[PDB]
Scaffold this active site. Structure first.
Site, PDB file in Angstrom:
ATOM      1  N   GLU A   1       0.552  -1.229   0.016  1.00  0.00           N
ATOM      2  CA  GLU A   1      -0.074   0.449  -0.150  1.00  0.00           C
ATOM      3  C   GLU A   1       1.175   1.342   0.385  1.00  0.00           C
ATOM      4  O   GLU A   1       0.492   2.001  -0.425  1.00  0.00           O
ATOM      5  CB  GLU A   1      -0.908  -0.077   0.823  1.00  0.00           C
ATOM      6  CG  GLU A   1      -1.414  -1.502   1.566  1.00  0.00           C
ATOM      7  CD  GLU A   1      -2.812  -1.431   0.379  1.00  0.00           C
ATOM      8  OE1 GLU A   1      -3.388  -0.858  -0.633  1.00  0.00           O
ATOM      9  OE2 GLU A   1      -3.382  -1.629   0.653  1.00  0.00           O
TER      10      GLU A   1
ATOM     11  N   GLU B   1      -4.842   4.856   0.461  1.00  0.00           N
ATOM     12  CA  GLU B   1      -3.645   3.644   0.233  1.00  0.00           C
ATOM     13  C   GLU B   1      -2.722   4.171   1.705  1.00  0.00           C
ATOM     14  O   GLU B   1      -2.544   3.156   2.715  1.00  0.00           O
ATOM     15  CB  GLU B   1      -2.479   4.232  -0.542  1.00  0.00           C
ATOM     16  CG  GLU B   1      -2.974   4.197  -1.924  1.00  0.00           C
ATOM     17  CD  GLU B   1      -4.126   3.028  -2.473  1.00  0.00           C
ATOM     18  OE1 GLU B   1      -4.120   1.975  -1.737  1.00  0.00           O
ATOM     19  OE2 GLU B   1      -4.393   2.607  -3.709  1.00  0.00           O
TER      20      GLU B   1
ATOM     21  N   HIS C   1      -5.079   2.479   4.052  1.00  0.00           N
ATOM     22  CA  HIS C   1      -5.515   0.727   3.655  1.00  0.00           C
ATOM     23  C   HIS C   1      -3.220   0.552   4.865  1.00  0.00           C
ATOM     24  O   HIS C   1      -3.766  -0.524   5.223  1.00  0.00           O
ATOM     25  CB  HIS C   1      -4.815   0.417   2.417  1.00  0.00           C
ATOM     26  CG  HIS C   1      -5.795   0.294   1.297  1.00  0.00           C
ATOM     27  ND1 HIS C   1      -6.415   0.511   0.048  1.00  0.00           N
ATOM     28  CD2 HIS C   1      -7.169   1.577   1.859  1.00  0.00           C
ATOM     29  CE1 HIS C   1      -7.146   0.785  -0.903  1.00  0.00           C
ATOM     30  NE2 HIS C   1      -7.998   1.466   0.837  1.00  0.00           N
TER      31      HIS C   1
ATOM     32  N   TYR D   1      -3.062  -1.635  12.335  1.00  0.00           N
ATOM     33  CA  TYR D   1      -4.132  -2.336  13.070  1.00  0.00           C
ATOM     34  C   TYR D   1      -4.310  -3.683  13.185  1.00  0.00           C
ATOM     35  O   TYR D   1      -4.862  -4.359  14.785  1.00  0.00           O
ATOM     36  CB  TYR D   1      -5.751  -1.443  12.908  1.00  0.00           C
ATOM     37  CG  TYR D   1      -5.948  -1.796  13.025  1.00  0.00           C
ATOM     38  CD1 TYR D   1      -7.945  -2.406  12.728  1.00  0.00           C
ATOM     39  CD2 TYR D   1      -6.893  -1.856  14.927  1.00  0.00           C
ATOM     40  CE1 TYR D   1      -9.446  -2.840  13.478  1.00  0.00           C
ATOM     41  CE2 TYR D   1      -8.384  -2.295  15.545  1.00  0.00           C
ATOM     42  CZ  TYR D   1      -9.171  -2.778  15.007  1.00  0.00           C
ATOM     43  OH  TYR D   1     -10.696  -2.658  15.651  1.00  0.00           O
TER      44      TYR D   1
ATOM     45  N   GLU E   1     -10.465  -0.759  -4.038  1.00  0.00           N
ATOM     46  CA  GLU E   1      -9.653  -0.705  -5.750  1.00  0.00           C
ATOM     47  C   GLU E   1     -10.538  -0.646  -6.985  1.00  0.00           C
ATOM     48  O   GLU E   1      -9.536  -0.640  -7.681  1.00  0.00           O
ATOM     49  CB  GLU E   1      -8.618  -2.364  -4.894  1.00  0.00           C
ATOM     50  CG  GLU E   1      -7.762  -2.336  -6.101  1.00  0.00           C
ATOM     51  CD  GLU E   1      -6.989  -1.680  -5.241  1.00  0.00           C
ATOM     52  OE1 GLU E   1      -6.622  -1.771  -4.241  1.00  0.00           O
ATOM     53  OE2 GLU E   1      -6.474  -0.465  -5.766  1.00  0.00           O
TER      54      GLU E   1
HETATM   55 FE   LIG Z   1      -5.074   1.067  -4.436  1.00  0.00          FE
HETATM   56 FE   LIG Z   2      -4.673   0.056  -1.794  1.00  0.00          FE
END
Ligand SMILES: [Fe+3]
Ligand SMILES: [Fe+3]
Ligand SMILES: [Fe+3]
Ligand SMILES: [Fe+3]
Ligand SMILES: [Pb+2]
Ligand SMILES: [Pb+2]
Lengths: 317, 317
Positions: free
Chosen positions: B88, B119, B122, B128, B226
C-alpha cells in the site's frame, strides 16, 4: 520463517529515522513509528472527516438572492471565495510536489496524505458554494488573476514555491534545507496560519450574526482542519531544526521574520480591499491588529520573538 | 469588478485542458472541469469513507489465538499481511512522487489526492490488524525483504518505478510519455489490478466461511476502494492514449503484454507460496486460472487482446 535470511538485517531501527535526508533506511515501511506526533495528527484529521455537501445552502441562497445584504457584505463574501478557491489548490499542490518528496519519513508522509486530501475537500467546498449561490465559478476561481490584493498574496507565495520544484533541488546541503524550511514557513505559517485565519474571521463574523450560515458552517469545518495543519507544520519545522541545528542561523531567523513582516503587509492590504468601509461592526483597522497579533503567535511557536505586540480584537477566535 | 483588467484573459478554456504535458494553461484552477470521469471517481471515493478501527477484531483475536486454525490457514493470513502492509505504501508513494507531477490536470489531481489518502487508510488497516492479533509488526512489515515470493513482486514493481523518479525525467517526448504509461500500467493494472485481487480472493475465502471476519470485512472495504482505483487508472491510460495516439505503438503494446505476462508468472509463484497444500477447499491450481483470467480482463480494458482464455473459478469475485 524467512526464506531470504539476510532480509532480517533490514528491519528498520527507530533511532535511524530522521525527518529529512534519511536515505540510508527503508522509508516505505511505516514501522517502527518514531514521530508519534505525526501519527496523532493523522488520527485526529481522519476523525474530523466531513463533506461540504452535507451542509444545507438553502437559507444562504435565499439570503444571497434577496435584497437583504448590502453591497459591502457581498464584497466580503466574494473576495474570500475568490482567494480561497485557488489557494487551497496552491497548498495541496505544494504538499505533494514539494513537501512530501523531501520529508523522508513514512509516518509524517501518512499525515501529509491526509492533509492533501483535506485541501481537495476544501476546494470542493468552494465549487459547491459557487454553484449553490449561482455565481460564475469561472470568474470566482480566476480572482487570483483579476483582483490585485489576491494576486499580490499569491505572487508572494510563489516566491517560496519555485525553488523547491527545480529538477536539481536537493536538501542535502545547508542552503538546500534552509530553502525547504522557508517553503514550510511560507505554506504552513504564512498561507495557512496568517492568510487563511484572516479570511476566517471575516466569514465567521457573518455566521455569528446568523447570516450565510451554510458558508459559515463550512468555514468552521475548514478552520478545524487548518488548526491541525498549522500544528503539524509547526511540529515538522521544529523537528527539522532540532535534528539539523546548523540550519537555524541568525541569517535564516531574520529572513523568516522578514517574510512574515511582508506577509502581514499583504494581508492588511487584502483586509482593506475586503472592508473599504466596514460591515457587521468590523473595520479594517481591527485587522491591522488581528493579523499582527496572530503573526506574533506564529513567530513564538517556531522560536522567534514577537515583533508587533498588538492585542487580539477577536477573542472568540 | 476586476481591478486587474487583463486578468479576465486568463480564464481557462475547457478545450485547452489535457491530461499530460498541459503547461500552457493554468493547472491550479479546478474549473471548468473537463474530465468529468475523474470528478465522479473523486465523489464516489469520498462516499466510500471508512476507518479500519470501526471494525471489531475480538472474534478474530480469539480465533487467531486458539488452536482452531491450521498452520496452513495461518500462513495465508501472514503472507497476505506481509505483502499488503508495504505494497500500500509503494502505491501511495508512486501516486504522489510519479503520477501527480505528470498528470497536468486539476480534476484528475483531485482524484489522485483521494486515492493516495485511501492508500494511507489501507496501510493503517494493516498496522491495526497486526497490533490486534499480537503479531510483531516489525516482522510483518519487513516481509518484502524476508519472503522471496513477495520480494520478487516488489522488485519487479521497482523496474517501473525508478525511471519516472529521475530528476531529469520528462513526459514531453514520445519515449518519456511511453515510460510514464508503463508506470501507470504497472501500478494500476498490475499491482492494484492483478497482484491485490489475488490476495483478496484468498482472504475473502476465509470471510465466506465465517473465519477471521474482522480481517475479511476490512478487505471488503479495501476491494471496494481498489475497484475505483483500477477504474480511474484505466480511464487515465485510455484518456492519455486518445490524446497522444502516436505513443500507442505495436512496440509499446507488446511491451505491456510482456509486463503483464511477467506479472502473472510472479503472482502464480506467490499463490503457490501461499497455498503449498490447499485450505478451505482452495488449491493453488485454481489461482493459475484466476490470475490468468483477470489478466485477460485487464488487457481488454486497455484495448489489448486476451491471451490466456481461462475461465474464472471464483464467480463470486
Ligand atoms: Fe489502490
Ligand atoms: Fe490500497
Ligand atoms: Fe485548506
Ligand atoms: Fe490547510
Ligand atoms: Pb503592498
Ligand atoms: Pb520466477
Amino acid at each position: 520463517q524467512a526464506d531470504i535470511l539476510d532480509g532480517k538485517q533490514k528491519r528498520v531501527n527507530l533511532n535511524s529515522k530522521r525527518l529529512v535526508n534519511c536515505n540510508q533506511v527503508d522509508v516505505n515501511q511505516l514501522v517502527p513509528i518514531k514521530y508519534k506526533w505525526a501519527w496523532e495528527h493523522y488520527l485526529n484529521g481522519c476523525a474530523n472527516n466531513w463533506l461540504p455537501t452535507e451542509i444545507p445552502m438553502g437559507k444562504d441562497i435565499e439570503l444571497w438572492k434577496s435584497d437583504r445584504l448590502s453591497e459591502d457584505e457581498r464584497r466580503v463574501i466574494l473576495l474570500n471565495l475568490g482567494f480561497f478557491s485557488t489557494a487551497e489548490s496552491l497548498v495541496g499542490n505544494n504538499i505533494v510536489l514539494a513537501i512530501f518528496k523531501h520529508v523522508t519519513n513514512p509516518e509524517a508522509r501518512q499525515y501529509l496524505l491526509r492533509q492533501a486530501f483535506e485541501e481537495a475537500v476544501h476546494t470542493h467546498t468552494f465549487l459547491y458554494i459557487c454553484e449553490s449561490l449561482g455565481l460564475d465559478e469561472k470568474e470566482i476561481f480566476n480572482a487570483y488573476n483579476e483582483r490585485a490584493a489576491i494576486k499580490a498574496k499569491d505572487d508572494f507565495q510563489m516566491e517560496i514555491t519555485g525553488k523547491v520544484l527545480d529538477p536539481n533541488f536537493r536538501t542535502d546541503s545547508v542552503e538546500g534545507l534552509q530553502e525547504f524550511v522557508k517553503n514550510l514557513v511560507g505554506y504552513y505559517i504564512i498561507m495557512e496560519g496568517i492568510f487563511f485565519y484572516s479570511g476566517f474571521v471575516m466569514i465567521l463574523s457573518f455566521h455569528r450574526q446568523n447570516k450565510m450560515i451554510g458558508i459559515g458552517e463550512q468555514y468552521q469545518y475548514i478552520l478545524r482542519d487548518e488548526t491541525i495543519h498549522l500544528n503539524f507544520g509547526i511540529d515538522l519545522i521544529n523537528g527539522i531544526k532540532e535534528e539539523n541545528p546548523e540550519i537555524w542561523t541568525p541569517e535564516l531567523q531574520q529572513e523568516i521574520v522578514e517574510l512574515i513582516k511582508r506577509a502581514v503587509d499583504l494581508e492588511i492590504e487584502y483586509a482593506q480591499d475586503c472592508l473599504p468601509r466596514g460591515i457587521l461592526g468590523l473595520r479594517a483597522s481591527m485587522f491591522i491588529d488581528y493579523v499582527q497579533h496572530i503573526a506574533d503567535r506564529r513567530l513564538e511557536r517556531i522560536g522567534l520573538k514577537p515583533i508587533y505586540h498588538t492585542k487580539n480584537p477577536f477573542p472568540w477566535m
